[PDB]
Write an enzyme that holds these catalytic residues in place. Structure first.
Site, PDB file in Angstrom:
ATOM      1  N   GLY A 174     -14.887   0.773 -11.419  1.00 39.58           N
ATOM      2  CA  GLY A 174     -14.482   2.019 -12.416  1.00 39.58           C
ATOM      3  C   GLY A 174     -15.276   3.103 -12.383  1.00 39.58           C
ATOM      4  O   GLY A 174     -16.556   3.106 -13.281  1.00 39.58           O
ATOM      5  N   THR A 197     -14.086   6.694 -11.519  1.00 39.73           N
ATOM      6  CA  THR A 197     -13.041   7.982 -12.040  1.00 39.73           C
ATOM      7  C   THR A 197     -12.453   7.803 -13.541  1.00 39.73           C
ATOM      8  O   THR A 197     -12.114   6.629 -14.104  1.00 39.73           O
ATOM      9  CB  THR A 197     -12.073   8.025 -11.205  1.00 39.73           C
ATOM     10  OG1 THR A 197     -12.550   8.405  -9.911  1.00 39.73           O
ATOM     11  CG2 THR A 197     -10.986   9.155 -11.522  1.00 39.73           C
ATOM     12  N   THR A 216      -8.364   0.698  -8.531  1.00 41.56           N
ATOM     13  CA  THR A 216      -7.773  -0.389  -7.959  1.00 41.56           C
ATOM     14  C   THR A 216      -8.368  -1.831  -8.253  1.00 41.56           C
ATOM     15  O   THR A 216      -9.656  -2.012  -8.484  1.00 41.56           O
ATOM     16  CB  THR A 216      -7.891  -0.059  -6.306  1.00 41.56           C
ATOM     17  OG1 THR A 216      -9.404  -0.185  -6.155  1.00 41.56           O
ATOM     18  CG2 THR A 216      -7.339   1.444  -6.207  1.00 41.56           C
ATOM     19  N   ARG A 255      15.684   6.595  21.978  1.00 42.04           N
ATOM     20  CA  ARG A 255      16.362   7.542  21.582  1.00 42.04           C
ATOM     21  C   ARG A 255      16.692   8.818  22.674  1.00 42.04           C
ATOM     22  O   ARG A 255      15.795   9.179  23.304  1.00 42.04           O
ATOM     23  CB  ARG A 255      15.761   8.129  20.341  1.00 42.04           C
ATOM     24  CG  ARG A 255      16.765   9.401  19.749  1.00 42.04           C
ATOM     25  CD  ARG A 255      18.028   8.669  19.183  1.00 42.04           C
ATOM     26  NE  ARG A 255      18.877   9.923  18.368  1.00 42.04           N
ATOM     27  CZ  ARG A 255      20.064   9.486  17.704  1.00 42.04           C
ATOM     28  NH1 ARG A 255      20.798   8.347  17.561  1.00 42.04           N
ATOM     29  NH2 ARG A 255      20.638  10.677  17.131  1.00 42.04           N
ATOM     30  N   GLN A 299       8.977  13.487  11.463  1.00 44.77           N
ATOM     31  CA  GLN A 299       9.852  14.797  12.273  1.00 44.77           C
ATOM     32  C   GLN A 299      10.615  14.167  13.474  1.00 44.77           C
ATOM     33  O   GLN A 299      11.971  14.224  13.968  1.00 44.77           O
ATOM     34  CB  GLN A 299       9.061  15.883  12.675  1.00 44.77           C
ATOM     35  CG  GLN A 299       9.644  17.136  13.134  1.00 44.77           C
ATOM     36  CD  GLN A 299      10.451  17.612  12.183  1.00 44.77           C
ATOM     37  OE1 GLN A 299      10.214  17.323  10.798  1.00 44.77           O
ATOM     38  NE2 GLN A 299      11.565  18.430  12.345  1.00 44.77           N
ATOM     39  N   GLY A 301      16.857  12.260  11.077  1.00 45.71           N
ATOM     40  CA  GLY A 301      17.269  11.870  10.056  1.00 45.71           C
ATOM     41  C   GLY A 301      16.778  10.530   9.538  1.00 45.71           C
ATOM     42  O   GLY A 301      16.759  10.172   8.564  1.00 45.71           O
ATOM     43  N   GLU A 317     -11.795   8.299  -2.663  1.00 43.10           N
ATOM     44  CA  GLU A 317     -13.275   8.303  -2.192  1.00 43.10           C
ATOM     45  C   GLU A 317     -13.683   9.576  -1.546  1.00 43.10           C
ATOM     46  O   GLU A 317     -14.400   9.550  -0.765  1.00 43.10           O
ATOM     47  CB  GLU A 317     -13.555   7.008  -1.186  1.00 43.10           C
ATOM     48  CG  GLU A 317     -12.912   5.784  -1.689  1.00 43.10           C
ATOM     49  CD  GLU A 317     -13.490   4.599  -0.898  1.00 43.10           C
ATOM     50  OE1 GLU A 317     -12.908   3.576  -1.011  1.00 43.10           O
ATOM     51  OE2 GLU A 317     -14.537   4.634  -0.159  1.00 43.10           O
ATOM     52  N   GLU A 353     -11.683  18.443   0.658  1.00 43.67           N
ATOM     53  CA  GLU A 353     -12.329  19.284   0.151  1.00 43.67           C
ATOM     54  C   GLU A 353     -13.846  19.051  -0.002  1.00 43.67           C
ATOM     55  O   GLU A 353     -14.728  19.617   0.251  1.00 43.67           O
ATOM     56  CB  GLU A 353     -11.650  19.979  -0.952  1.00 43.67           C
ATOM     57  CG  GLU A 353     -10.539  20.745  -0.733  1.00 43.67           C
ATOM     58  CD  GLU A 353      -9.192  19.756  -0.243  1.00 43.67           C
ATOM     59  OE1 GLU A 353      -9.023  18.627  -1.106  1.00 43.67           O
ATOM     60  OE2 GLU A 353      -8.464  19.863   0.736  1.00 43.67           O
TER      61      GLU A 353
END
Lengths: 386, 386, 386, 386
Positions: A125, A127, A159, A273, A341, A345, A368, A372
């Site tokens: 713990g 955060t 977690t 496909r 993508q 569908g 973690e 940034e």
């Protein structure tokens, strides 16, 4: 085998491990993503592979594996179940890794054996509701009392928060000398699931990694013995940084696994496909995506193996672990979005696993250390070297 | 007001419309995303605003609104509820738009009034299990029989598939002259919900737009009268293309709405949330994301308004509609992913709406022509002009 | 006609203008890029068109054109010669635009006539060796003396620096109340080419826009009369920003012109070059690039048209001019880069124009506010309206 | 040491090599970029180092270096002079590499000695005016005649084309069984600089790499002896691809070198340039770029090291060489572009090296297989293993 390939030792371990994962973990991944039911059944079995004490030395009841091998084991897990991989990666890296790092011989003998066996899962713990990236801005406090400490505060997104047997919590024991030095005066506490003083908050509904236990922890005048203090008083944050460096390698491995799964699926699918009289893989609009994703995932794998190596070699790897996690998480999510993508569908329906791969991988760019934040860590290291 | 701004007429309509959306639609958006419960309650109320017959001329019981105004109404809807916006956009553009386009006076008088009022929602069946982008490769067939036609085939991912009152289905009535001309020999059929011959398949669990009705349709020796034939026999695909051009403008508007919502939320959040002693918006790592997203969304809005204008002006807009939908869908999903990033851990939890914005917007890069397909349509138009 | 489209009146000006450009400007663009020889011949010919007084009211001898039309003319010029475009745009927007904005009736009657006829090219000197983005950190000073002021300092990258007949220089006249507000205390000064006191520095070679006059200016005890003060003393910085808002629209138009030229060339080329038995345009690796670029530059064109529209309507356009410039420059450079890629080895040789388009367009992401600076400007405005 | 790291033996070679480069190559890089004067002085000095016989076995007079070490040397050269790097890389990889790969014992004893000592620079002519990516579409022919063959045709963009002492040209000797298999029937021919029959074309100016000899070759009834046939008749194309696999590793290394130089310069610059009262490196708009580039080029370095490793181990590396080249070139160009951005106006002037780094690196995305071509190669291999 060449350095970047799995050695003789690695594949003798990973081979049956992958077989076990395909047969026992893969089948219920889709369901766990829907129900969020924690895999207590699989935890028990994985513990046997030493997966919950992988880095813990055998002397304390662990597997004594290297960072490199464990990182690859995390990638293999993530490939079939993102939540389980986070469960394993965090358990080993944070709670466990922190006790292994700063724990006294007595603390290691008391905690490690149970963590390493899966008996007690580890929650870490750091955060809180009001601080994530700026972790040293935590408000939880530890008041010195007769016989030990009394903790008060709230931890967010922990977690193994509700299923943990062992908890490691960071709290302020002393005031900071100045505001720019708030990282000073923070200490860590290791303790077993309290009979009181620790309640879990409302379960957290997440975009992905559904079966991963993530919870809010509220410490209410929680008392812990003098033996709870982990590491030197007031210098707990320094250990946190060290611990985060190690965890980032695992999260990077985790990202690669999910991205590879998404890539493998899109490859197979695009090969079968067909559209306009031919396999869609024959269209550059599709093949280019597959080529870029594969190239970046490979680069990402090399980066985390490198970071793992530097750690195993007892060398500094802060920059390298930040680069691996940043590159892997970004590349993996990208690959997953492209796999969606490519399936058209079908990429939008839960009958297929790519939408889950993306939802699971998405957290790797946040947990973690956000991308940034990692870019800041990297740049700083680069600048001081100039 | 300048062309790109809302005119006097537009804001007199959009002003109260937005108020209605904030008060009656926004409140249950998060729940509908979890339950998937179709908003029959809101459909009734929206019908009153002429939202379900927006482009249908008043002569047939419609609102007679312009493409431009409807496009903006779709953007406003999407801002608060992606599923509802798809419901509205598809209903108006596909089933309805197709009958308005190729329907005989008799067919328009029979179908339009009920569609325009919301009484009968419209389903448009083109896609099949084996063909999406290559729509003219559909296998559904229409056999000429005494008194009309008998249809056999399967349609996939049809919105309003299970709740529709009116169905428009594309089927092959004649063999193609050659394989490269398979778009020839396809016809369209408009009919009311059959008492038999049409069953819906298993509900589809989707990544997003949960409350949007999407279903598989199986036609079993379904009989429809001679009056069911919509448009000229064997030339139905040409109408489909025309219909898709119009729909793309709405889907582009839809994308912009979701992206704007994500952007507005990230802006407000970044202004309040603080880290390292200041609002995170003050970090370029965050502000740059907001600036790029806002710039692209604005460009996307201008593009769809332009496409809408060309249609209202009775001018060709195939290229322009493809460009708007492509740019908007891509920019919107990007903005949504960045909004998730900006909220950090909170962007990963369902307590906040950005993860939903992304999941909802994601389909806009797939539906009514994948980005890959649209790039082909654009390039072809560009090349023949050279 | 439709707003986003060239109207009848715009075409009457632009159509003939483009032919002049194609016949008189295009022929020597490649040579000017190599020699860097300032196009006096073309400047004189364009001046006869009122191009150098486009925005100057007819009452002062200008063409009295709208911002919208001028922007389109800059795009048209840039299509054939980037250097000429910058020459024309900066002249009208900066030195001229500044005098038109803050100049008294007397100054306007004195300067505007000669600038608008081209008899005197305008140079606007804000940037210095030690400050670009942080322009308010300029060091040039002007001290009050009998009869006027004496300016001392150096200016960097000043367009028209050595060929100008009128100069507008920014210099500090009063000490800043603090560093956080150094912009206060800066003044602007307008004056005809000095007889002495102004020295041009060693010319430096640029990556592109070779033929544009870009010079360093050294002011040594330069004397200017009382009537040189442009706007109020110490309040000239606000005027600087307003001037930059307008210039950015022209830079956006310039970027679009260069990107369009690169796109057009790539289109034509891709349509004629064959590989593997077909025009390379039939490969998505090429066509997708063409589609993306066309889409982005149209979007870029709509943004600068919008910005220009707001300005012509006397409305705030700071945010919009920043977005147009940011998007146009970024999109144009990318399009030019793709055009090089599409030509393969030929894109790397100077016998073809695409490598010049990139080199010329590359400056649009730096001049008049870097892309980074524009994102800050954009973000701040978005945050303020939040 | 650790694999991804320079070992003791590599440092013993590279360390001293870099100092030589810094002292003898760096000084005149800017001038060579302007004059395009072929560096005979440096070629001669490097040859004395066995740089032009790096991969040639000692038995043939070469240095007998591993692919890994050679790649690193190319990166080091490229760091200071892109043109020299291409000169060195192409020489070793293409003409030399081809003779070493397919040449008989006699040819190797005849050519390798002179190529390895630098006494003869190698030119490899595959590309023609009408075919680059589709190299098997080459039109040069060689017809059998008494004593050998007579070659007729033209080659385009041939490095070392006009200064070479040994040439290896690909020409058709037998008709293709069909268009789908035009690669069959192509042969390779090795020969010393002809006394007659070979004409160099009008030299063309390049965007960058100015000082590298890039010439068009015109073969007019050129006669070569029987011993000129390199490899088996009509089967030379397979050898061409193998040669390209190896060359791509050197091109990847070259790209990394240029990107690293741009990164280093940007780092140092960002650390000394100040704006708004602080080094610009403290602005995420700058530091994030630095972090991303450093991360990507390290990743790029690991990829080419891997590819080189596979080659030195005599294992398949086609896919890996393609990935290394693709990623390194793309990442390097982007890093170089960012470095220009970071220097602002100074990145646009030739007094600083960053604009040259970009211009030099830009070719790495085109030469020896465009990025598009490499993605096809990569995708195909991934699909085959699926």
């Amino acid at each position: 085998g060449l350095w970047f390939e799995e050695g003789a030792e690695e594949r003798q371990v990973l081979g049956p491990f992958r077989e076990f994962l395909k047969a026992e973990v893969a089948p219920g991944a889709a369901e766990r993503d829907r129900t969020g039911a924690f895999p207590w059944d699989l935890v028990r079995k994985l513990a046997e592979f030493g997966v919950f004490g992988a880095l813990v030395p055998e002397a304390y009841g662990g597997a004594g594996l290297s960072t490199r091998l464990f990182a690859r084991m995390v990638e293999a897990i993530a490939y079939y179940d993102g939540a389980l991989a986070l469960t394993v990666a965090s358990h080993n890296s944070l709670a466990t890794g922190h006790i292994l790092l700063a724990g006294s011989e007595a603390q290691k003998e008391a905690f490690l054996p149970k963590l390493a066996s899966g008996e007690a899962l580890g929650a870490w713990g750091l955060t809180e509701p009001g601080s994530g990236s700026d972790a040293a801005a935590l408000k939880t406090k530890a008041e010195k009392v007769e016989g030990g400490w009394r903790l008060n505060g709230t931890k967010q997104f922990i977690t193994q928060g509700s299923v943990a047997g062992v908890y490691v919590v960071m709290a302020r024991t002393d005031p900071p000398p100045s505001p720019e030095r708030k990282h000073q005066g923070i200490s860590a506490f290791a303790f077993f699931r309290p009979e009181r003083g620790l309640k879990v908050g409302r379960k957290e509904e997440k975009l992905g990694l559904t079966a991963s236990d993530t919870a809010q922890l509220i410490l209410e005048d929680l008392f812990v013995p003098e033996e709870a203090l982990l590491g030197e008083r007031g210098k707990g944050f320094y250990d946190v940084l060290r611990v985060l460096d190690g965890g980032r390698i695992g999260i990077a491995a985790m990202a690669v696994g999910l991205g590879q799964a998404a890539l493998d699926y899109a490859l197979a699918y695009a090969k079968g496909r067909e559209a306009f009289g031919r396999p869609i893989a024959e269209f550059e609009g599709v093949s280019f995506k597959l080529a870029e994703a594969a190239t970046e995932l490979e680069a990402a794998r090399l980066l985390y193996l490198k970071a793992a190596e530097l750690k195993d070699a007892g060398r500094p790897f802060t920059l390298e672990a930040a680069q691996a996690k940043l590159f892997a998480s970004e590349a993996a999510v990208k690959a997953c979005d492209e796999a969606i993508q490519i399936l058209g569908g079908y990429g939008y329906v839960k009958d297929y696993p790519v939408e889950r791969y993306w939802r699971d991988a998405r957290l790797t760019r946040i947990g973690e250390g956000t991308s940034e934040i990692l870019k800041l860590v990297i740049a700083r290291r680069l600048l001081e070297a100039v």
